[PDB]
Amino acid sequence: SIGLALLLLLLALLFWLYIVMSNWTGGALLVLYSFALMLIIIILIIFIFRRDLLCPLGGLGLLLLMITLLLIALWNLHGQALYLGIVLFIFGCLLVLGLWIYFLEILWRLGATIWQLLAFILAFFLAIILLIIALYLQQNWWTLLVDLLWLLLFMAILIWM
Amino acid sequence: SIGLALLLLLLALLFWLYIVMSNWTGGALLVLYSFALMLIIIILIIFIFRRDLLCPLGGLGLLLLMITLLLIALWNLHGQALYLGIVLFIFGCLLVLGLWIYFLEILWRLGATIWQLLAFILAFFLAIILLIIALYLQQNWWTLLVDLLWLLLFMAILIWM
Amino acid sequence: SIGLALLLLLLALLFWLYIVMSNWTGGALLVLYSFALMLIIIILIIFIFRRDLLCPLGGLGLLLLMITLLLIALWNLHGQALYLGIVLFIFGCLLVLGLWIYFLEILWRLGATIWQLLAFILAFFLAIILLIIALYLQQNWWTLLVDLLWLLLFMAILIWM
Amino acid sequence: SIGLALLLLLLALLFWLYIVMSNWTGGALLVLYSFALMLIIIILIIFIFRRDLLCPLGGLGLLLLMITLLLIALWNLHGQALYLGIVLFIFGCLLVLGLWIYFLEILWRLGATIWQLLAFILAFFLAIILLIIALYLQQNWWTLLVDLLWLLLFMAILIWM
Amino acid sequence: SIGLALLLLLLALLFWLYIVMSNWTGGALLVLYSFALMLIIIILIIFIFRRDLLCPLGGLGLLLLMITLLLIALWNLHGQALYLGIVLFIFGCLLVLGLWIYFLEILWRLGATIWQLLAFILAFFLAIILLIIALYLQQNWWTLLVDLLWLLLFMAILIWM
Amino acid sequence: SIGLALLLLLLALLFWLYIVMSNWTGGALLVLYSFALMLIIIILIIFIFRRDLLCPLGGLGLLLLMITLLLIALWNLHGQALYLGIVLFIFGCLLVLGLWIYFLEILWRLGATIWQLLAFILAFFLAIILLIIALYLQQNWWTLLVDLLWLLLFMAILIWM
Known part of the structure; x- marks a missing residue:
């Protein structure tokens, strides 16, 4: 169980970091490929530590993974398909904001201060701006x-609890 | 818990089908996007039903997801980076065969007949050839x-047990 | 409840009689529209006369209505979208056959001669060939x-049960 | 029974989502096809959730379905048949308005506030204007x-009751 | 302490991975850099697993590291300094062979079979030939x-003992 | 154990003395190689004289060795790979500073005057500037x-503890 999870994490980190050095001065799709494997790494880490938290954080990571796959697919589209994919990505973005609000509300119910709440909101929005x-x-x-700061952001959580 | 998982599954299926109907007569990268979307869907389905089986089958699905992301990343490379990515994909393929062998051994230890073992081997290799x-x-x-037959293959399992 | 249902039935018959002899020169699309309206009549007939059989028979009527709408969308659609449409149409037809097999099994469990079961099977396949x-x-x-024969077949299957 | 209904709802979702993006720069007929499968989605949702509510609300869904099929038939027609279809569609609109005000009065009898009634009336008329x-x-x-907004409008109903 | 060693091992893996693909069509110096990073990986692994084995095995790892650094220094030199470095590298090779045979004799004293001894000798010489x-x-x-094969060769050791 | 360690130390000093005055005209790469060998000596010194301090001091020596190897790979690497190399080098330098802070905290906990702690801090920063x-x-x-000063600094930090 643990050994398999660490082996999978090693594979994920290796593939990610290789993808990061692949094709110097490459296209914009490379950032999305690296971010997707960072999302896989984060899912694996949530699986390894605090398995009970796989529902909110695992759902968040898998949702971001789906959003990144959708962005990769619709990046090159130049028609009504592009607009339709944009509308699907908007739906995904609203629902991920909803899930983040739900997770934030659970954290507040746990008894965190308002300063920590504001810090987490600013950290997540700064991470989104950073990815942009x-x-x-x-x-x-x-x-x-960017990818390592996203990893740090998703690693600080699940350690706060 | 259940409602969130079904909502995520609905998004995953919606994004997958849209991606499939996007860019008629598109490139070869579309098949990889759709397959990755289904790997997320199958991860979600194993999460919903028989949560205790998230280690072998979830690991298999996430491993296939990393393999597909690696293939998307190296598809356009035309140098030593392509060969290095090929060597990483070979490592991933050997380790996926190893995990499949481990899962098959667990199934045999459960007490399945040799005919079922051979049927599962042939089904998985037929799925790989189909994807090719x-x-x-x-x-x-x-x-x-091809993707729906992969979904059926990964849905028949976790129902056998 | 009865008054609303009878009003809807009268409206359905009026609409269908209008649509059948509407253009006098239209192609197969008019045939498909009339068949869809006939399926709506069928669904109303189950909902009013017998009831409690919505899942076995009304479900089949609504499934065939979906199949007819997909066929309407499939016509004059030269290109590669027609191929995926054919795939989905085949999936729906397989579901139609599966439900029919399930209803056949239920009827056999209730108790019926094999000759009369074969009579229903031949009637359904003959109706499909008529529609084709x-x-x-x-x-x-x-x-x-063809629509009158479909109505008579569904009335007979409702009244014999 | 319930599983069959869920499978039918999944097939309906697949069919709708395919029809929406069958072709690009399509005519209003594609819009009507998508709206008809959304109405089918609505009917399967109502049947799945509570089968006792299919008298007023199932009738309403079938009535909008029937009206949409009339519109699809009318698009092709241009002669006196078009005028007769316009008159008959006006009759259908009067009947749907009667059913809607009957359901509204039933809701008010249940003890709903006047503000909620006005909100529901405004939401329905806004959805109609959006479809237009x-x-x-x-x-x-x-x-x-517009299809998902109609879905959400019918999700506000069938949940409050 | 252990966590610090694991973090150092992770940083070493990152550094090695990066050096391997710093530039394409690189010289033998890049191969030597990657091999030195692998020797550092070996030393971290030995320290993490069992700290009592760093007397023969840690000395061996440091000795190959030192030898690699001599080779890196020698590549640039071409004069009499190259000859002196060749002599000094020959001395280092004799000393590494002496340690290796000392460790082999210790393993035989532990009670290892002659076939396993010959297999280990052949594996080490094959790894050296692969590095060459x-x-x-x-x-x-x-x-x-070759770096991962050396890693696996050093994984055969530190595990059997 | 002592004999092998002393033999390795003699080999290290001979190697380093050879490598320093090896070319007489080589650039900064020779300085980096000599510093790496000088660090290997330090690690051997920690392993032979005091021992049991491998994690605090030997870990820092091996970390600085990784930093030196990464710097060696960084030189004459004009292009965009140099930027990611700088990023990884900055990460390693941050780890060096963190370890140094941890060892400082350990030393303060053991009990030391603030002036002497500042003396160690100034000595380390002066050594870094000398190397630069x-x-x-x-x-x-x-x-x-510079190498002699580094050796003396590590001798003092080993003997004072």
Whole structure:
């Protein structure tokens, strides 16, 4: 159980980091490929530690994974299919905001201070802005930092509890 | 818990079917996107039903997901990076065969007949050959069938037990 | 409840009689629309006369209505979308056959001679063949006969049970 | 029985989502096809949740379905048959308005506030206007949006009761 | 302490992975850098698993590390300093062979079979030949393969004991 | 155990003395190689004189060795790979600073005057600055002084504890 999970995590990290160095000065899709494997890594970490938290955080990670796959698929579309995929991505973005609000409410019910709540909201929105900047800048030295800061953000949680 | 999982499954199925009907006569990368979407769906289905089986089958599904992401990343590479990604994909393939052998041994220890063991081996290898054919044929009517037969294969399991 | 249902039935028969001899020169699309309205009549007939049989028979009527709507969307759709549409239409037809087999099994469990069961099977397949030849015979008089035969078949299957 | 209904609802969802993106820059007929399968979705949701409510609300769903099929038939017609269809569609609209006000009065008898009644009336009329503008605006974007908004409108009902 | 060692091992893996694919069509110096990083991986693994085995095995790892660093220094040199470095590297090779045969004799004293002894000797010499051919074959493919094969060879040790 | 360790130490000192005055004209790469070998000596010194301090001090020595190897791979690497290499080098330097802070905290807990702690901090930063200026001063005589100062600093930190 534990050994298999660590082996899978090693594979995930290896594949991710290789994808990060693959195709220097590559396209914008590389950032999405790296972010998707970061999401897989985070899902594996939530599976390994605090297995009881697989519902909120695992759902959040898998939802972000689906959103990234949708973005990869609709990136190159140049028609009504692009608009329809945009509308599906909007639905996914509203529902991930809803799940984040639900998780935030559970954390507040646990008894966290309002300052921690605001810090978590600012951290998540800063991570989203950071990923947007990573998409705009096809550079790999910044994609590595974005992905590792996302990993740190999703690792600080599940350790707070 | 259950409602959130069904909502996530609905999103996953919606995103998968849209991606399948996106970009008629599209590239070969579409098949990989649809297959990855189904791997997320199958992860969700194993999560919903028989939660105790999330270790072998969930690990198998997440491993196939990483393999597909690696294939998407290395598809366009035309250098030593392509060969290195091929060597990483070979490692992933050997380890997926190892995990399948482990799962097959657990099933045999449960007390299944040798005919069922051979049927499962043939079903999995037929699914792999199907996916190869789906990659070769960029056609969507066949990607639908290949991915749905993969879904049926991974749904028959976790119902046998 | 009875008054509303009878009003809907009268409205359905009026609409269907209007639509059958509506254009006098339209193609198979008019045949499909008339067949869909006939399926709606059938569903109303089960809901009013017998009831409590919505799942076995009304479910089949609504399934055939979905199949007819998908067929309507499938016509004059030259291109690769027609292929995936054919795949989904085949899936729906397989579901129709499966339900029919389930209802046959229920009828056999209730107790019926094999000759009479074969009579129902032959009647259903003959109705399907009539509909198929009606799609190629757009004289707006054979459609009426096919729809009347469908009504009579469903009335008989409702009254014999 | 319930599982059959769920499988039928899944097939209906697949059919609707395919029809929505069958072809791009499609006519209003595609909008009507998508709306008809949404009405089928509504009927299967009502049957799945509470089978006692299919008298007023199932009748309403079948009535809108029947009206949409009339509209589909009318699009092709251009002669005196078009005028007769317009008159008959006006009769159908009067009957649907009668059923809607009957259901509204039943809801008020249940003890609903006047503000809630006005909100429901406004939501229904806004949904109708949205469907009309989606018929005017021949896009797969607005069509899908109006379909899910109709789904949410029918989700506000069948839940409050 | 143990967590610090694990974090150091993770950083070492990141560093090695990166160096392996720093640039494409790189010289033998990149192969030596990757091999040095693998030797550091070996030392971390030995320290993490059992700290009592760092006398023979840790010395062996440090000795191969030191030898690799000599080779890296020697590649640039071409004069009499190259000859002196060749002599000093020959001394290092004699000393590493002496440690290896000392460890082999200790293993035999533990009660290992002659066949296992010959197999271990052959595996070590095959790994050395593979490293030599990877030096000859300046590719990031074979380099990574030889590095993981050396990792597996050192995994056969530290596990049997 | 002592004999092998002393033999390795003699080999290390001979290797390093050879490598410092090896080329007489080589650039900063020779400085980096000598510093790496000088660090290997340090690790051997920790393993032989005091022992039981491998995690605090030997871990720092091996971490600095990884940093030096990454720096060696970083040189003459013009391009975008140098940027991700800088990112990883910054991560390793941050880990070095963190370990140093942890060891400082351990030393303070053991009990030491703030002036002497500041003396160690100033000595370490002065050694880092000496190494930095040595990379830019490739006269092959300043490297010897920097390495001797590093050896003396580690001797003092080992003997004072």
